[PDB]
Amino acid sequence: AGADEERAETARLSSFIGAIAIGDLVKSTLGPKGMDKILLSSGRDASLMVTNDGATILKNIGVDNPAAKVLVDMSRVQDDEVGDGTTSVTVLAAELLREAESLIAKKIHPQTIIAGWREATKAARQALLNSAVDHGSDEVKFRQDLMNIAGTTLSSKLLTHHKDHFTKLAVEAVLRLKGSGNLEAIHVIKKLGGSLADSYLDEGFLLDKKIGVNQPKRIENAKILIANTGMDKMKEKVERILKHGINCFINRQLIYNYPEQLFGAAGVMAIEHADFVGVERLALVTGGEIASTFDHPELVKLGSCKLIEEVMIGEDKLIHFSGVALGEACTIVLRGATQQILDEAERSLHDALCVLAQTVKDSRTVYGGGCSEMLMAHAVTQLASRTPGKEAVAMESYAKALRMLPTIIADNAGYDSADLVAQLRAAHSEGKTTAGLDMKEGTIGDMSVLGITESFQVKRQVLLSAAEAAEVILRVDNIIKAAPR
Amino acid sequence: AGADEERAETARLSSFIGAIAIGDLVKSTLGPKGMDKILLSSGRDASLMVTNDGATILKNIGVDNPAAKVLVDMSRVQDDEVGDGTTSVTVLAAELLREAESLIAKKIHPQTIIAGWREATKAARQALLNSAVDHGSDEVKFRQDLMNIAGTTLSSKLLTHHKDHFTKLAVEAVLRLKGSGNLEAIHVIKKLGGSLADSYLDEGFLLDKKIGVNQPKRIENAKILIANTGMDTDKIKIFGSRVRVDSTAKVAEIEHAEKEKMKEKVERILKHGINCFINRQLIYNYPEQLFGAAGVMAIEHADFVGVERLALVTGGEIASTFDHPELVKLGSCKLIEEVMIGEDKLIHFSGVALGEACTIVLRGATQQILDEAERSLHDALCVLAQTVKDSRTVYGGGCSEMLMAHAVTQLASRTPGKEAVAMESYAKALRMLPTIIADNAGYDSADLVAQLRAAHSEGKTTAGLDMKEGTIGDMSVLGITESFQVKRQVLLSAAEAAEVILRVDNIIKAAPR
Amino acid sequence: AGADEERAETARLSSFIGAIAIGDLVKSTLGPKGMDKILLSSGRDASLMVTNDGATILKNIGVDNPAAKVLVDMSRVQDDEVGDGTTSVTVLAAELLREAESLIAKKIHPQTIIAGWREATKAARQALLNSAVDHGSDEVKFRQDLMNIAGTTLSSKLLTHHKDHFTKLAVEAVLRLKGSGNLEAIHVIKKLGGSLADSYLDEGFLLDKKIGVNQPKRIENAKILIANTGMDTDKIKIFGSRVRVDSTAKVAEIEHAEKEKMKEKVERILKHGINCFINRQLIYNYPEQLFGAAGVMAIEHADFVGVERLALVTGGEIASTFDHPELVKLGSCKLIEEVMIGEDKLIHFSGVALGEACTIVLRGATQQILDEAERSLHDALCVLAQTVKDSRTVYGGGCSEMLMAHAVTQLASRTPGKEAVAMESYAKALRMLPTIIADNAGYDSADLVAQLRAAHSEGKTTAGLDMKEGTIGDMSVLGITESFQVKRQVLLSAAEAAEVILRVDNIIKAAPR
């Protein structure tokens, strides 16, 4: 006789344990003082892995018997759409379970309590249309372009001491990116000499490769050739080449020595072992080409002409592809001082892009730093008092849930948790939307001034996501019999 | 394992356990559907006692080591000043301790939350400010004489079927009492006869005793004699010895000497015109026969408590040795008689010159429960004396508590920093009271809380918990009101009591083993 | 199950453990946001004695086997020199032990390191010249009479709302005290009454005892009698044994002899016109009946300490055998009576001719925390007597301590070889004091240390630790100052007690089960 019979008191615990286990690991990740974690397993796992993003690690494994596999899976749809922001959605779902210990003291009917989940669907829409906050973030944006959300995602990252300036740059990269062109052609590198600003933006794509020291310095009315197959024959290449006026050749692999002599005399600049990732991005940029065998020249290849040249950047020399007709795709260079801190700039450009692509499609935003959170709480707390009977405990409990978010942001900072809560609520109560939690300040401040803003998508489906797994607990009562107790 | 060593959180727990243990027994006692508890012990106690009043049971017993007895002692002063109503003050202090679990969740300096006690006073100012009180207490009064506060005290008790009529009667009793006299001489006894009124008011005092089957049926222009000493004579503590005389002939003197006690009692008593003799203790058999022929009614084992009130009533007398007759005794005279009150024989003392002391003998419908009138009458006395002196009242049934609770939730969010957490915890303390009142009613506690809360928000001070209803209703229509004094003092007392010991971490050791 | 068993390095740990246990209890106490702890013991201990002042509680009880009592005893000599304000000296010694973990790491000669305490000898001197500004307190002093250092002692204490006023009162007491008298005959007691002032100044002496239920309530133009020997008589030094005798009249003679003692006491008491008799011990019952009829009030078991002060006040007397009345007894006469302070019965001796000694009586909330007033009060009288005598002070709030700490860091590098390790360990000993003051404040200790060092390093002596602020501020505005003497003695005192600790290390116990 066997099975899994735990019920009511015991049954509640299995769901409860899954939520508490996940929350401790993910809470550390959140905000400025977040930390990276290392994990390893036997069977189909090579070695310890460390992931900054909470979502990536949860999906790669299915460690044990308690239920949490389904809850975790949903966050990816959120990631495919909006995703990361900062990882907080998993945490909120987990905290709803803590009140259940309190519920034993309620001592009457947990099923009645379920009314709250139905309430929660309306509560989900309390987040929306219950308060004005902001909304603008239209598109392009002069002052609200950045000095917002990228900084919040950025905050978890260590580099924030000078990185905030770098984060601010990222929106310009996405503004050009927008539209239905597609999400590609984004490239970031760092340089060993520069300034306080610590970053620079280039109009076109930046590549660090050269044919050799010989060949003409600059090409104009440039024609671009991309070949799938390497140069690893001399006569076919020259005859086709002269008619076109071939200014530059880019090959994604090793290149035969013989062609190099011909390119130099002709006046053609070629690139040896160019990376595939740069090439695909470039193809979308030029207008594409059909790349195959040496027949590839003439118009099977589409060449965009503005100017391809090697341009001095405050020290070493690099090759710049710029003035592209498409305009859809662009690159950011960045500058430094050979500092340990400088290669660090590599770390946060990547996270900045992920939030931004979503910022353009929603064309809607909310104030970050918990600004929305206290504000919703102020609006929702009285709603429960207003409603009669059994319902107020259910609706109020969700409303009190909002109170913790201000507190979670405060705990990472290291400031007194009780102190942070009171000061926050009064500002929001007054009616100023820009006011929010300032972790560095230890109190409250203008969120817009510091930056931090949140993508609209993260707020609409975080609430939907929380109810996605939370209700399938108490709601169904069958898993029974076999052995005693 | 064992030593009675306390560390950080555990020390907090000892204060915590005392609060919760007391609260469960007390909570069921609050309101209309309160419960009676009976307590017994083998010695230095004779029988189980049941006390409806929470304050009385706590005072008598110090059961164990954990602190709580001193907190309990505080309600006494409140009781003599304003009194009772329903016992709710003790429960409120206890619930303050429940947040403390959330306090370790703070993971920080516990005593800055103490500022909450400095928020408690802010809460106290608003209680004074927001409640809606009353206007009017003319004196004696026609319609507003009662159907108010006495009813709320009674509401807590199930007698409120026919009894609310009885409560109404009690103010008439207080009107004569009213003023200078303070509290004395109010006596209540039940009658086994059914009637709508269920009560009668008497100008004099009823005592239930008889000399014996024989004796004159009635006495008038009655003279009253009270004796501190019994009519019994033979030992004297120091026997004087076994005794030696001069054989059997003189011992005749000993038996004869008894007669002298008889002779003094008759001769002196007759001159006065003695109609009634009342003695607080056992009475010697020889005198009993004498009283019957004379035309004098005496009372065997008349208890002292009735007597002290009676003395104030008749102007009193100096009770001593048999010299006691004549002038040293002052006997008021109107009418002393034993009257069949349809049911059981009782003796009526009436026509008292003083006028200060009077008796409320109630008849009412019978069962064991008419003894309830004893329970219930006592409550009536305490509320009216305060009601006349204060000339101020607040709405009962928890109406006051929900209104204040709605206001305090707003306050927490408004105050910045450290303070809101402290203020909000005091604020949600108020939430439990609606729940405590609803739970004993037998209705579901959760359903009751939100509906109550919504009505208060509107601005209706009158709206409150209706336990009989099972939902919410208008308290004012009921006529239930609480005296003004009970609410302002409790707020100051509750905060301060719980506050000291949280402050102190460690109840320490001893020498012994 | 019991094991123990300590040798060499672990032996050292026993010295280490004593310091850590004491520091946690005392740390809460130092500073405005202080803490109160209660201690209970049985066996020559009544119950619940609580002391805020660290020195009084440690001195009274030797709780357990580990060595620490000798260190505690030393604090009292410091108390006599100047002593208090806030109890900080014990904590400084305790932290010095933490560095010793480093010494095992050092792994050479721990006694060579002992040079550090000698090194500390001129470290103390460095703090003796560069610290604070504020000197003389001229004489009597109008404004500068207080609102200064007594207030700082009080600042640590939690009664400082009403209490700062009480402190102001204490300097008035020292001004009368001032002269060639030095420091004697001042006694102050709290009372369970409630007034805004919370204190009164008495021209004479206050005592709390009564003769018995009977006796005249008040005496005028009173004569005071103080007797060393009790009224009780019958057992001299040699009994005269227990004897039979043999007559039916002799046993009576000894009872008669008792009467003679009664006769002497009344006949000569009347000639004097004695109004009050005060005896330090038990009093025989026979005279008590006598005093009531005569119209003389007497006090049973009056405390000796009160009596000696009273004697200087009334001109004194020669306290011998019953010959004591008349000329050998000096009785000052104004008013001796039991006065209704407000809540309890007290006896007031007043109008003393001498004027040299006066008494202060405090009024308060009630419940052992009003004993807090005795706690603050004890500190108040003593601080003032030396503040005027020393003629100089230093800034409080740890301002003095951080400055010296910055200076001592330089010193360690400067001393060659062995000495630098020893000197630098002493140097960080100063660092904990800022931490202890901040910790009881509830603010985060780590952040506080860093911000503090930068302000002292800059060159501003006035700047220090502000607990209310949660950062650093100007000490002088607060009015917190420390006696120059407390700082000179503490530096010398800490080393000697701590030194004893290193030299011990070995405690011996023999074997298992």
Side-chain angles (χ1 to χ4, degrees), chain A residues 240-273:
Chain A
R240 300 290 184 231
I241 271 190
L242 180 61
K243 70 190 190 176
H244 200 202
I246 190 70
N247 291 100
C248 182
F249 180 90
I250 190 170
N251 190 340
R252 196 260 112 201
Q253 50 187 267
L254 290 310
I255 190 166
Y256 217 20
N257 290 335
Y258 290 85
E260 280 20 53
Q261 290 180 65
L262 180 67
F263 281 90
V268 180
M269 180 180 60
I271 300 170
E272 190 252 310
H273 200 269

mmCIF file of all heavy atoms in Angstrom, chain A residues 240-273:
data_model
loop_
_atom_site.group_PDB
_atom_site.id
_atom_site.type_symbol
_atom_site.label_atom_id
_atom_site.label_comp_id
_atom_site.label_asym_id
_atom_site.label_seq_id
_atom_site.Cartn_x
_atom_site.Cartn_y
_atom_site.Cartn_z
ATOM 1 N N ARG A 240 36.372 39.839 -61.699
ATOM 2 C CA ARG A 240 35.040 40.199 -61.196
ATOM 3 C C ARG A 240 35.091 41.467 -60.336
ATOM 4 O O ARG A 240 34.199 42.312 -60.365
ATOM 5 C CB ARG A 240 34.448 39.027 -60.405
ATOM 6 C CG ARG A 240 34.285 37.757 -61.234
ATOM 7 C CD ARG A 240 33.185 37.880 -62.281
ATOM 8 N NE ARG A 240 32.994 36.620 -63.003
ATOM 9 C CZ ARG A 240 32.974 36.507 -64.333
ATOM 10 N NH1 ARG A 240 33.135 37.573 -65.106
ATOM 11 N NH2 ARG A 240 32.798 35.315 -64.890
ATOM 12 N N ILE A 241 36.146 41.532 -59.540
ATOM 13 C CA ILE A 241 36.428 42.629 -58.611
ATOM 14 C C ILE A 241 36.602 44.033 -59.213
ATOM 15 O O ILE A 241 36.016 44.993 -58.713
ATOM 16 C CB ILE A 241 37.656 42.228 -57.752
ATOM 17 C CG1 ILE A 241 37.189 41.475 -56.493
ATOM 18 C CG2 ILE A 241 38.614 43.374 -57.459
ATOM 19 C CD1 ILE A 241 38.280 41.245 -55.467
ATOM 20 N N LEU A 242 37.395 44.164 -60.265
ATOM 21 C CA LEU A 242 37.658 45.485 -60.852
ATOM 22 C C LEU A 242 36.392 46.209 -61.363
ATOM 23 O O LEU A 242 36.239 47.410 -61.148
ATOM 24 C CB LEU A 242 38.692 45.369 -61.968
ATOM 25 C CG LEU A 242 39.050 46.686 -62.661
ATOM 26 C CD1 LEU A 242 39.640 47.673 -61.658
ATOM 27 C CD2 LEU A 242 40.029 46.437 -63.796
ATOM 28 N N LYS A 243 35.501 45.487 -62.047
ATOM 29 C CA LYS A 243 34.271 46.088 -62.602
ATOM 30 C C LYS A 243 33.356 46.698 -61.521
ATOM 31 O O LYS A 243 32.755 47.752 -61.719
ATOM 32 C CB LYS A 243 33.480 45.043 -63.401
ATOM 33 C CG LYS A 243 32.848 43.965 -62.530
ATOM 34 C CD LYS A 243 32.280 42.818 -63.346
ATOM 35 C CE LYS A 243 31.447 41.890 -62.473
ATOM 36 N NZ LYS A 243 30.799 40.809 -63.263
ATOM 37 N N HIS A 244 33.248 46.000 -60.398
ATOM 38 C CA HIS A 244 32.413 46.423 -59.275
ATOM 39 C C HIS A 244 32.984 47.666 -58.585
ATOM 40 O O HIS A 244 32.244 48.534 -58.124
ATOM 41 C CB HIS A 244 32.229 45.274 -58.276
ATOM 42 C CG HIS A 244 31.042 45.442 -57.367
ATOM 43 N ND1 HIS A 244 30.922 44.799 -56.153
ATOM 44 C CD2 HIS A 244 29.897 46.154 -57.526
ATOM 45 C CE1 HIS A 244 29.756 45.103 -55.607
ATOM 46 N NE2 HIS A 244 29.117 45.924 -56.420
ATOM 47 N N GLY A 245 34.309 47.725 -58.504
ATOM 48 C CA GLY A 245 34.966 48.821 -57.808
ATOM 49 C C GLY A 245 35.221 48.461 -56.358
ATOM 50 O O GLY A 245 35.577 49.313 -55.549
ATOM 51 N N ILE A 246 34.982 47.173 -56.069
ATOM 52 C CA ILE A 246 35.159 46.540 -54.745
ATOM 53 C C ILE A 246 36.086 47.300 -53.782
ATOM 54 O O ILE A 246 37.298 47.389 -53.959
ATOM 55 C CB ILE A 246 35.671 45.100 -54.929
ATOM 56 C CG1 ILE A 246 35.640 44.315 -53.618
ATOM 57 C CG2 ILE A 246 37.056 45.113 -55.515
ATOM 58 C CD1 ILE A 246 34.246 43.988 -53.139
ATOM 59 N N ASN A 247 35.480 47.913 -52.800
ATOM 60 C CA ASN A 247 36.227 48.655 -51.803
ATOM 61 C C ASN A 247 36.618 47.822 -50.573
ATOM 62 O O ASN A 247 37.690 48.020 -49.999
ATOM 63 C CB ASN A 247 35.404 49.856 -51.410
ATOM 64 C CG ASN A 247 35.306 50.851 -52.549
ATOM 65 O OD1 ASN A 247 34.305 50.899 -53.262
ATOM 66 N ND2 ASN A 247 36.351 51.648 -52.731
ATOM 67 N N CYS A 248 35.764 46.878 -50.174
ATOM 68 C CA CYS A 248 36.051 46.059 -48.991
ATOM 69 C C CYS A 248 35.448 44.654 -49.074
ATOM 70 O O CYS A 248 34.323 44.460 -49.532
ATOM 71 C CB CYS A 248 35.528 46.765 -47.733
ATOM 72 S SG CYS A 248 35.858 45.890 -46.183
ATOM 73 N N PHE A 249 36.216 43.679 -48.614
ATOM 74 C CA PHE A 249 35.780 42.285 -48.600
ATOM 75 C C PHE A 249 35.786 41.745 -47.162
ATOM 76 O O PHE A 249 36.773 41.875 -46.450
ATOM 77 C CB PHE A 249 36.734 41.479 -49.499
ATOM 78 C CG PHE A 249 36.444 40.006 -49.612
ATOM 79 C CD1 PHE A 249 35.604 39.531 -50.603
ATOM 80 C CD2 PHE A 249 37.035 39.095 -48.750
ATOM 81 C CE1 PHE A 249 35.356 38.179 -50.734
ATOM 82 C CE2 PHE A 249 36.787 37.742 -48.875
ATOM 83 C CZ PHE A 249 35.947 37.283 -49.869
ATOM 84 N N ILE A 250 34.695 41.137 -46.733
ATOM 85 C CA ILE A 250 34.632 40.571 -45.385
ATOM 86 C C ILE A 250 34.367 39.060 -45.443
ATOM 87 O O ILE A 250 33.373 38.600 -46.006
ATOM 88 C CB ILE A 250 33.597 41.315 -44.499
ATOM 89 C CG1 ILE A 250 33.719 40.874 -43.038
ATOM 90 C CG2 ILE A 250 32.182 41.119 -45.009
ATOM 91 C CD1 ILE A 250 32.912 41.725 -42.077
ATOM 92 N N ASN A 251 35.272 38.289 -44.864
ATOM 93 C CA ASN A 251 35.158 36.833 -44.892
ATOM 94 C C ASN A 251 35.072 36.257 -43.474
ATOM 95 O O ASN A 251 35.899 36.572 -42.620
ATOM 96 C CB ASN A 251 36.371 36.278 -45.639
ATOM 97 C CG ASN A 251 36.284 34.800 -45.964
ATOM 98 O OD1 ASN A 251 35.524 34.045 -45.361
ATOM 99 N ND2 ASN A 251 37.072 34.387 -46.948
ATOM 100 N N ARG A 252 34.086 35.400 -43.234
ATOM 101 C CA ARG A 252 33.909 34.798 -41.909
ATOM 102 C C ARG A 252 34.692 33.483 -41.755
ATOM 103 O O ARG A 252 34.099 32.421 -41.609
ATOM 104 C CB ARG A 252 32.415 34.520 -41.701
ATOM 105 C CG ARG A 252 32.006 34.258 -40.261
ATOM 106 C CD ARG A 252 31.850 32.766 -39.986
ATOM 107 N NE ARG A 252 32.885 32.269 -39.080
ATOM 108 C CZ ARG A 252 33.236 30.989 -38.986
ATOM 109 N NH1 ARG A 252 32.635 30.075 -39.739
ATOM 110 N NH2 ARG A 252 34.196 30.624 -38.150
ATOM 111 N N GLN A 253 36.019 33.563 -41.844
ATOM 112 C CA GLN A 253 36.910 32.402 -41.655
ATOM 113 C C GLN A 253 38.345 32.724 -42.055
ATOM 114 O O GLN A 253 38.687 33.875 -42.320
ATOM 115 C CB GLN A 253 36.395 31.110 -42.311
ATOM 116 C CG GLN A 253 35.974 31.219 -43.760
ATOM 117 C CD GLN A 253 35.331 29.931 -44.226
ATOM 118 O OE1 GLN A 253 35.989 29.045 -44.765
ATOM 119 N NE2 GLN A 253 34.034 29.805 -43.972
ATOM 120 N N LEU A 254 39.177 31.697 -42.123
ATOM 121 C CA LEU A 254 40.577 31.871 -42.496
ATOM 122 C C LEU A 254 40.671 32.244 -43.980
ATOM 123 O O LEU A 254 39.841 31.831 -44.792
ATOM 124 C CB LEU A 254 41.383 30.592 -42.217
ATOM 125 C CG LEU A 254 41.611 30.246 -40.734
ATOM 126 C CD1 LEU A 254 42.147 31.446 -39.970
ATOM 127 C CD2 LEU A 254 40.338 29.715 -40.089
ATOM 128 N N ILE A 255 41.696 33.004 -44.336
ATOM 129 C CA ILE A 255 41.841 33.491 -45.706
ATOM 130 C C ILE A 255 43.189 33.096 -46.313
ATOM 131 O O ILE A 255 44.240 33.198 -45.679
ATOM 132 C CB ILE A 255 41.684 35.035 -45.759
ATOM 133 C CG1 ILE A 255 41.587 35.525 -47.197
ATOM 134 C CG2 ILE A 255 42.855 35.718 -45.074
ATOM 135 C CD1 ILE A 255 41.099 36.954 -47.323
ATOM 136 N N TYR A 256 43.118 32.565 -47.524
ATOM 137 C CA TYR A 256 44.301 32.125 -48.257
ATOM 138 C C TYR A 256 45.252 33.290 -48.532
ATOM 139 O O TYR A 256 44.825 34.406 -48.788
ATOM 140 C CB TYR A 256 43.890 31.446 -49.557
ATOM 141 C CG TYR A 256 44.746 30.258 -49.951
ATOM 142 C CD1 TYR A 256 45.532 29.572 -49.024
ATOM 143 C CD2 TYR A 256 44.753 29.811 -51.261
ATOM 144 C CE1 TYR A 256 46.295 28.485 -49.402
ATOM 145 C CE2 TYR A 256 45.516 28.726 -51.640
ATOM 146 C CZ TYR A 256 46.282 28.067 -50.711
ATOM 147 O OH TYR A 256 47.041 26.987 -51.096
ATOM 148 N N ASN A 257 46.540 33.015 -48.399
ATOM 149 C CA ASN A 257 47.593 34.021 -48.586
ATOM 150 C C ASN A 257 47.652 34.649 -49.997
ATOM 151 O O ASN A 257 47.902 35.846 -50.125
ATOM 152 C CB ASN A 257 48.941 33.371 -48.271
ATOM 153 C CG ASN A 257 49.098 33.076 -46.792
ATOM 154 O OD1 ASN A 257 48.472 33.718 -45.947
ATOM 155 N ND2 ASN A 257 49.924 32.087 -46.473
ATOM 156 N N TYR A 258 47.457 33.839 -51.040
ATOM 157 C CA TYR A 258 47.520 34.323 -52.439
ATOM 158 C C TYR A 258 46.667 35.585 -52.719
ATOM 159 O O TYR A 258 47.184 36.563 -53.256
ATOM 160 C CB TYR A 258 47.135 33.203 -53.410
ATOM 161 C CG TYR A 258 48.161 32.100 -53.504
ATOM 162 C CD1 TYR A 258 48.162 31.053 -52.593
ATOM 163 C CD2 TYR A 258 49.126 32.105 -54.502
ATOM 164 C CE1 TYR A 258 49.097 30.041 -52.671
ATOM 165 C CE2 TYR A 258 50.066 31.095 -54.587
ATOM 166 C CZ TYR A 258 50.046 30.066 -53.670
ATOM 167 O OH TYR A 258 50.978 29.057 -53.751
ATOM 168 N N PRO A 259 45.367 35.605 -52.325
ATOM 169 C CA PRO A 259 44.481 36.766 -52.553
ATOM 170 C C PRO A 259 44.967 38.059 -51.894
ATOM 171 O O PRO A 259 44.715 39.146 -52.409
ATOM 172 C CB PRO A 259 43.148 36.339 -51.939
ATOM 173 C CG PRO A 259 43.196 34.859 -51.877
ATOM 174 C CD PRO A 259 44.636 34.494 -51.691
ATOM 175 N N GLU A 260 45.688 37.943 -50.785
ATOM 176 C CA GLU A 260 46.163 39.128 -50.057
ATOM 177 C C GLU A 260 47.064 40.003 -50.927
ATOM 178 O O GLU A 260 46.978 41.228 -50.867
ATOM 179 C CB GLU A 260 46.950 38.717 -48.799
ATOM 180 C CG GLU A 260 46.133 38.308 -47.565
ATOM 181 C CD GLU A 260 44.697 37.889 -47.828
ATOM 182 O OE1 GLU A 260 44.462 37.008 -48.675
ATOM 183 O OE2 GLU A 260 43.808 38.418 -47.135
ATOM 184 N N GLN A 261 47.928 39.385 -51.724
ATOM 185 C CA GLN A 261 48.800 40.158 -52.612
ATOM 186 C C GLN A 261 47.987 40.953 -53.647
ATOM 187 O O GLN A 261 48.299 42.105 -53.949
ATOM 188 C CB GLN A 261 49.738 39.214 -53.366
ATOM 189 C CG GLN A 261 50.801 38.568 -52.497
ATOM 190 C CD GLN A 261 51.703 37.645 -53.290
ATOM 191 O OE1 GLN A 261 52.443 38.084 -54.172
ATOM 192 N NE2 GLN A 261 51.625 36.351 -52.999
ATOM 193 N N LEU A 262 46.930 40.321 -54.173
ATOM 194 C CA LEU A 262 46.071 40.958 -55.182
ATOM 195 C C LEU A 262 45.228 42.111 -54.636
ATOM 196 O O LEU A 262 45.074 43.141 -55.295
ATOM 197 C CB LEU A 262 45.125 39.901 -55.757
ATOM 198 C CG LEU A 262 44.158 40.404 -56.825
ATOM 199 C CD1 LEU A 262 44.909 40.806 -58.085
ATOM 200 C CD2 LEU A 262 43.111 39.344 -57.126
ATOM 201 N N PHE A 263 44.698 41.934 -53.431
ATOM 202 C CA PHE A 263 43.879 42.967 -52.793
ATOM 203 C C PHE A 263 44.663 44.263 -52.565
ATOM 204 O O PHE A 263 44.138 45.362 -52.752
ATOM 205 C CB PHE A 263 43.262 42.434 -51.488
ATOM 206 C CG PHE A 263 42.044 41.559 -51.712
ATOM 207 C CD1 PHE A 263 42.172 40.190 -51.878
ATOM 208 C CD2 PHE A 263 40.778 42.108 -51.760
ATOM 209 C CE1 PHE A 263 41.062 39.393 -52.090
ATOM 210 C CE2 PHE A 263 39.662 41.317 -51.968
ATOM 211 C CZ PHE A 263 39.805 39.958 -52.136
ATOM 212 N N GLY A 264 45.928 44.116 -52.160
ATOM 213 C CA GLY A 264 46.784 45.274 -51.910
ATOM 214 C C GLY A 264 47.025 46.148 -53.132
ATOM 215 O O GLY A 264 46.950 47.371 -53.047
ATOM 216 N N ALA A 265 47.327 45.519 -54.266
ATOM 217 C CA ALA A 265 47.571 46.255 -55.510
ATOM 218 C C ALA A 265 46.287 46.880 -56.065
ATOM 219 O O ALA A 265 46.294 48.001 -56.574
ATOM 220 C CB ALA A 265 48.194 45.332 -56.547
ATOM 221 N N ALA A 266 45.198 46.126 -55.971
ATOM 222 C CA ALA A 266 43.882 46.570 -56.440
ATOM 223 C C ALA A 266 43.378 47.801 -55.685
ATOM 224 O O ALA A 266 42.783 48.709 -56.267
ATOM 225 C CB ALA A 266 42.875 45.436 -56.321
ATOM 226 N N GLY A 267 43.616 47.806 -54.383
ATOM 227 C CA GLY A 267 43.149 48.886 -53.534
ATOM 228 C C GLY A 267 41.879 48.482 -52.812
ATOM 229 O O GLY A 267 40.955 49.277 -52.644
ATOM 230 N N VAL A 268 41.862 47.230 -52.376
ATOM 231 C CA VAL A 268 40.702 46.641 -51.717
ATOM 232 C C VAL A 268 41.031 46.173 -50.296
ATOM 233 O O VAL A 268 41.998 45.442 -50.078
ATOM 234 C CB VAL A 268 40.186 45.445 -52.524
ATOM 235 C CG1 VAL A 268 38.973 44.815 -51.853
ATOM 236 C CG2 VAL A 268 39.895 45.849 -53.954
ATOM 237 N N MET A 269 40.211 46.568 -49.340
ATOM 238 C CA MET A 269 40.431 46.202 -47.943
ATOM 239 C C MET A 269 39.576 44.979 -47.550
ATOM 240 O O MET A 269 38.358 45.012 -47.613
ATOM 241 C CB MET A 269 40.083 47.430 -47.091
ATOM 242 C CG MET A 269 40.248 47.253 -45.597
ATOM 243 S SD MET A 269 39.817 48.742 -44.682
ATOM 244 C CE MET A 269 38.108 48.947 -45.166
ATOM 245 N N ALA A 270 40.240 43.901 -47.133
ATOM 246 C CA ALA A 270 39.559 42.648 -46.753
ATOM 247 C C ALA A 270 39.740 42.309 -45.266
ATOM 248 O O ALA A 270 40.725 42.664 -44.655
ATOM 249 C CB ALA A 270 40.054 41.501 -47.623
ATOM 250 N N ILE A 271 38.825 41.566 -44.686
ATOM 251 C CA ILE A 271 38.950 41.245 -43.264
ATOM 252 C C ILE A 271 39.037 39.736 -43.027
ATOM 253 O O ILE A 271 38.146 38.971 -43.388
ATOM 254 C CB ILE A 271 37.769 41.844 -42.472
ATOM 255 C CG1 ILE A 271 37.757 43.369 -42.637
ATOM 256 C CG2 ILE A 271 37.857 41.460 -41.005
ATOM 257 C CD1 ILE A 271 36.510 44.037 -42.102
ATOM 258 N N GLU A 272 40.155 39.337 -42.416
ATOM 259 C CA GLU A 272 40.444 37.931 -42.127
ATOM 260 C C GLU A 272 39.778 37.439 -40.841
ATOM 261 O O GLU A 272 39.904 38.058 -39.784
ATOM 262 C CB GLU A 272 41.958 37.721 -42.012
ATOM 263 C CG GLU A 272 42.368 36.255 -41.951
ATOM 264 C CD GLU A 272 42.857 35.814 -40.588
ATOM 265 O OE1 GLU A 272 43.726 36.500 -40.013
ATOM 266 O OE2 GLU A 272 42.378 34.768 -40.103
ATOM 267 N N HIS A 273 39.096 36.305 -40.957
ATOM 268 C CA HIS A 273 38.422 35.648 -39.832
ATOM 269 C C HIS A 273 37.404 36.552 -39.126
ATOM 270 O O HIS A 273 37.310 36.551 -37.898
ATOM 271 C CB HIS A 273 39.457 35.104 -38.835
ATOM 272 C CG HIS A 273 38.924 34.034 -37.928
ATOM 273 N ND1 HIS A 273 38.354 34.297 -36.698
ATOM 274 C CD2 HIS A 273 38.854 32.693 -38.090
ATOM 275 C CE1 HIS A 273 37.959 33.165 -36.146
ATOM 276 N NE2 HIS A 273 38.249 32.176 -36.970
#
